[PDB]
Amino acid sequence: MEKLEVAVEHLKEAIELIEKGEYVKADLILTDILRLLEEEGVKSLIKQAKELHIEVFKLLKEGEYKEAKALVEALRVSVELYILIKRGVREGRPIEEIAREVGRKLVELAKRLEKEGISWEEIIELIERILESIREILKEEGLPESEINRILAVSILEVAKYLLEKLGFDYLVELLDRAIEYILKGRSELAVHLLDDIIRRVHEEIERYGDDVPEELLLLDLLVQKARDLAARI
Amino acid sequence: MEKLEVAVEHLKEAIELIEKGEYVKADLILTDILRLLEEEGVKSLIKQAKELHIEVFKLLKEGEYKEAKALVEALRVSVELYILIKRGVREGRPIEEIAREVGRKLVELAKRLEKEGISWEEIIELIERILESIREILKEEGLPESEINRILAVSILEVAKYLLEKLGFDYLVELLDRAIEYILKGRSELAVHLLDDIIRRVHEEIERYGDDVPEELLLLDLLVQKARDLAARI
Amino acid sequence: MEKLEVAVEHLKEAIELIEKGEYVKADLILTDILRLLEEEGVKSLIKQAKELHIEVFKLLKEGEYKEAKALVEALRVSVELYILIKRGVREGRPIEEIAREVGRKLVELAKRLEKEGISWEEIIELIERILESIREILKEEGLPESEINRILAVSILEVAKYLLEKLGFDYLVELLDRAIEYILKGRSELAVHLLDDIIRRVHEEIERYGDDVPEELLLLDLLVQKARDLAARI
Amino acid sequence: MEKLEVAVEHLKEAIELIEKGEYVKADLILTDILRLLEEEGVKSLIKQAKELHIEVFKLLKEGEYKEAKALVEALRVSVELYILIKRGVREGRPIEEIAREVGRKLVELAKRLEKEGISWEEIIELIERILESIREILKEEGLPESEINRILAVSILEVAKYLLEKLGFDYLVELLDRAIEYILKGRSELAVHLLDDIIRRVHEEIERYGDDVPEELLLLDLLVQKARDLAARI
Ligand SMILES: [Zn+2]
Ligand SMILES: [Zn+2]
Ligand SMILES: [Zn+2]
Ligand SMILES: [Zn+2]
Ligand SMILES: [Zn+2]
Ligand SMILES: [Zn+2]
Ligand SMILES: [Zn+2]
Ligand SMILES: [Zn+2]
């Protein structure tokens, strides 16, 4: 799969070019990356690359350098995640470590985007787009719905855990590791009950905050709720 | 149809790059524009873009910057005209205002090329190539032959009117507006008779000039004759 | 076939760009050349161009400028050779002069690569890849196996003759021209016997050298042996 | 096609022999040329060669050396034109340059015959016979009627242009280049209108001359009229 590694290197080159200030070369590199991905033949990556070309051209016209860099980084993370999923499935790796790797990659991307200056709503939306791409890729590999839902729930819960650590709620963090371990080991109903208790605690914290609720708490609430829904659907 | 607007912006970027002096980037941009147009799926635009790539590469090798700029501007005008035709047909706009817009765009392109330094024979040939592209595009939209011929005749007559204004024959200009109005309102036979009288007057002027006939008069003669043929075919 | 001449000019531009130091523009030019060749529709050239893009990107990442330049020059020579083969076959040119032209082009490429600093093993491998491409192209034109083998044997023998001239064995050179003339005139069995005698003389020279045999002598041995095999298969 | 080059060399030898004074050897050479052309297998050339043998024998009996030389030169030009047409069609050359070459060859033949002392009526008749041979040859190559008519019209117009230059009508010459360019570029109706205006101007010149009209003007009138008919039939 060296074509996809070449695509990843190109994407890094495109990020560096946008940083330098050459936007024509960045647009041409995006076209080259689209050609490479179409040569490989992954549909989700292909549509993401085409929309990336169009939207990055528009943003570079307007002057939104950070948004274009974020979109390129999101596509890069998506391609690397597809590579790692294929390597894990071929090598017969356990679903557990694949899910942990996906969560780690998503958290690293979120930390990068937070360092750049992108707001957390945009970060969450980019992460969910990547998660939908991951869902399609996993469904392509013939995996059943249970493991797909498990991986997605674990990744969402890892992002939520990073948010909780930022907020400073250590006990909820510990309960989150417990729930993640239960999801990974296959014990679904216990994890769902744990997630219900976590949701109640989060709502109590939000109600305590009152009118000055930080946006991270609301995003964490939404993330934990959708992770609980996925764990129920397992 | 934002893909075609992105293509138009690219074409503007290509013109600016040719002006600056970066010919490799211009060639690569032309390839990108061809990819965009093929993604959209308009056959005439696609063949025009491929021949544009080849011929602009050759001309930039030779050093004919103005000819390459003229070809890129012609493709840009053709793409914008296709966009406007699609918007007019979808919105149910009257054929009259569509024809007036097409004529205005062609006259603006001719004025631009005249300012650049391209001779009037090349300008006329480029305009007729654009007109053939317009004819194909209009036939694609399911329009009948009568309105297509009306639009084409009006555009040709607007170019001829600009030529007459340059020459300084005001009365022939006024007769030309009368004929254009008659064509636009649907009165075809009156317009054909008016065009016959205009052709006779133009031939009288040419015969008066003798051996020192400017080329604009001969080009105007040819344009009015072909417009009269189209009006007859309406 | 002006598309292939445009591709050749592009390849020259790519070599010049690699020499200057712009590797992004070189990568983009390689993508453009691949698009041109795919537009023309020659399968061997297409696969060679794709692998060239990938490998040149990798080498320019590593810093092997000379290897990338050699690969681009090999693709350029292959495209020019295809052009000349098509022109010769269409014009009904004799197989003799086509074979002489192919040999001259291969020798010029080898001299160029030797001047650059590429070792003779790499030069020979590149030449054999070009020869396999030539074999496929000739088989496409509907030529029978005898003339294809004759052309390939003549080209290999011309490369071997250049190697012998470098070594300084004039008599073996003269015998090689005699064998090449016999192959070109159609006399195959006499050429095979001459090649057997040449092979015996080369082995005698190698045995005389002992442990200090230059690599050119061994490469010449292999080349003459494969040329004799092709001449037998005629 | 080296047989036809041998035939051309023979025809040159025959012209030289007629110039020297050996008429028996010239008759025998004409028989040899007929045998060569029949070996090649071009019907028009074959019938032309047989009638050439008969008529040159008769003329050399009578003493009309110049007429026999003119007939041999006409056959030579016809054979060379067939060679060039075949080379152009095989090589995929554009119709434009083929037409220009045919016109140049016809003008050179006309200049040669004028230098010899043959009258312009005979020159025109020989040229039209060659043109009919060209029409048959082009129809043999599978070309459609439009390009055949275009080539024939361009050649006739080039002969007419030479006549106009001899007469000394520069403005009509310039209009003729304009019409030739329009025919070559494919714009037929504009060329027909231009030819109509040229015909009117030529008739005005003839009427101005009165009773002392040179024959070149009448031949030019006929040539331009037939070229206009061919351009209309395009
Ligand atoms: Zn672009
Ligand atoms: Zn509980
Ligand atoms: Zn290019
Ligand atoms: Zn009237
Ligand atoms: Zn690339
Ligand atoms: Zn022997
Ligand atoms: Zn005889
Ligand atoms: Zn006129």
How would you describe this structure to a colleague?
This is part of a larger assembly, with 4 copies of chain A (234 residues). Chain A is mostly helical and 234 residues long. Chain A is built from 10 helices and no strands. In chain A, helix 4 (65-90) packs antiparallel against helix 5 and helix 9 (188-209) runs antiparallel to helix 10. Chain A is globular and about 50 Å long. At the C-D interface, loops of C face loops of D. The complex binds zinc ion (8 copies). Residues 27, 31, 53, 57 of chain A line the site of one zinc ion. It is classed as metal binding protein. Keywords: Zinc-binding protein, metal binding protein.
Largest interface: B-C, 10 and 14 residues
Q: What would you call the structural class of chain A?
A: mainly alpha
- Outline the biggest β-sheet of chain A: none
Q: How large a portion of the residues of chain A is in β-strands, by DSSP E? A: under 5%
Quaternary structure classification: part of a larger assembly
Share in helix of chain A: over 70%
Report how far apart the termini of chain A are. 31 Å
Task: Quickly count the helices of chain A.
Answer: 10
Q: How many strands of chain A?
A: 0
Order of helices and strands of chain A: HHHHHHHHHH
If you compute it from the alpha carbons, what radius of gyration of chain A comes out, rounded to the nearest whole angstrom?
A: 19 Å
PDB class: metal binding protein
Keywords: Zinc-binding protein, metal binding protein
Entry title: Cryo-EM structure of designed zinc-induced icosahedron Cage-i53-Zn1-HEHE-16
Chains A, B, C, D: Cage-i53-Zn1-HEHE-16
